[PDB]
Amino acid sequence: MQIFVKTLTGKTITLEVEPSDTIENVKAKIQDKEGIPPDQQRLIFAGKQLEDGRTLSDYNIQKESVNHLVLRLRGG
């Protein structure tokens, strides 16, 4: 399935993912596209912070056809 990520500029990228994919797996894909180390990423879905050992299915990524995660840059 495809998801969007809103990036630090408010633009979107698309990732090809499966519901069982971990948040750590998603953050690695975001690192490859946006150059943010995973330990400096905070990923949000519907205002909820996503935890690295959990999966997209844990956050019900399947409920909607179109989903946008939000990338935030941890503060220094």
DSSP line for 3-71? EEEE-TTS-EEEEE--TT-BHHHHHHHHHHHH---GGGEEEEETTEEPPTTSBTGGGTTTSSSS-EEEE
Query: What is the domain range of residue 68?
Result: 1-76
Structural determination approach: X-ray
Number of domains in the chain: 1
Resolution of the solved structure (Å): 1.6
Give the whole-angstrom CA distance, residue 48 versus residue 28. 19
Tell me whether residue 66 is exposed, middle or buried, using C-beta atoms within 10 angstroms of its C-beta: 0 to 12, 13 to 18, 19 or more.
exposed
Bridge partner list, 14: 4
CA dihedral 39, 6, 2, 63 (to 10 degrees): 90
Do the beta carbons of residue 3 and residue 69 sit within 8 Å?
yes
